Amino acid sequence: SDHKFLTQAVEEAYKGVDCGDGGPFGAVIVHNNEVVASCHNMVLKYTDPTAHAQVTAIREACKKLNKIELSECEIYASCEPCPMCFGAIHLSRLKRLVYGAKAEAAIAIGFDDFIADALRGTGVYQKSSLEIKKADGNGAAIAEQVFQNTKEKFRLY
Amino acid sequence: SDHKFLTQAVEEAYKGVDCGDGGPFGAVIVHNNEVVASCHNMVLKYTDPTAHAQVTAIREACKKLNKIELSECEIYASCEPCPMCFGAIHLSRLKRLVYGAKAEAAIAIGFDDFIADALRGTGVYQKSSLEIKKADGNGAAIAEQVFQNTKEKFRLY
Ligand SMILES: [Zn+2]
Ligand SMILES: [Zn+2]
């Protein structure tokens, strides 16, 4: 079931970048094989620098379920969550995080080297207990190629 | 000018708790001695675990200035920003952060031990360039007293 929801996140990223909502990032929040929220980066549409794919998905899932905690749901991120999105994932009480592409795949096309210490385990004050899975195989390949595909769809300006 | 805007952030914290919007946290975003945003925690009001005081202040400052970067403004936080809010402050490019109370003052009344390595200078992956000032003297007294005065007035989240 992981592959289906991670691919849906990659499809959210492509749709969002295509319609100009924001960067090529998508996220899907799943409650026990049922999709609760499916969104992409909305920074340019919302004029909100905090409207990343993960944060947007969390806001919409929490509105739909009338709760501020998602301890029964899991989040699928087309790309490794930034420090802000990882913090938001912690606060949301989400029980599991699956992500497809390493932050370096996004850095390769000009994004900030803005990596979450708590996700990679390099923190002194911030420790994460959350279950984290880096996608492998085909899911990782699909997520990983998103950034070169969108840089070359937009290369000729 | 720091004490005046920090005091306004503390006032926002008290407002939000009194009207039930959220926890005792407030934030003020200032552009060149003029207030662009003044907000408090809206987690309970919005059913949104990302609606901290800093995040809310940022979205509203970006709506008022209709831009997704705040490199000319500064933020005053009644309490030390968590990893999510500090990440949002990084992404917003805010140039200065003044905060009143250490996170431990909020932890003492039941909040998560949720501390931002990049703020305290222990981050490896997350590099912060903005100037950060922890308030002392009366600013610290006011910000710390927020938590003993609001004890058992609000719902913990
Ligand atoms: Zn992010
Ligand atoms: Zn916060």
Residue numbers in the entry:
A (entry chain D), B (entry chain A): 29 to 185
Article sentences:
In plants, guanosine deaminase (GSDA) catalyzes the deamination of guanosine for nitrogen recycling and re-utilization. The other involves the hydrolysis of Gua to guanine (G), followed by its deamination to xanthine under the action of guanine deaminase (GDA). The zinc ions are tightly bound to the active site, coordinated by the completely conserved residues His80, Cys113, Cys110, and the key water molecule. AtGSDA catalysis needs two key sub-processes: the activation of water and re-capping of the active site, which proceed via the two critical residues Glu82 and Tyr185, respectively.
Despite its reported strict specificity toward Gua only, we managed to identify that 2′-O-methylguanosine (2′-O-mG) and N2-methylguanosine (N2-mG) could be employed as reasonable substrates of AtGSDA by testing a series of Gua derivatives, but the structural basis is unclear. In contrast, E82Q did not produce any products when incubated with 2′-O-mG or N2-mG under similar assay conditions. We found that while WT and Y185F/E showed similar binding affinities toward the ligands, the Y185K and E82Q mutants showed differentially reduced affinities.
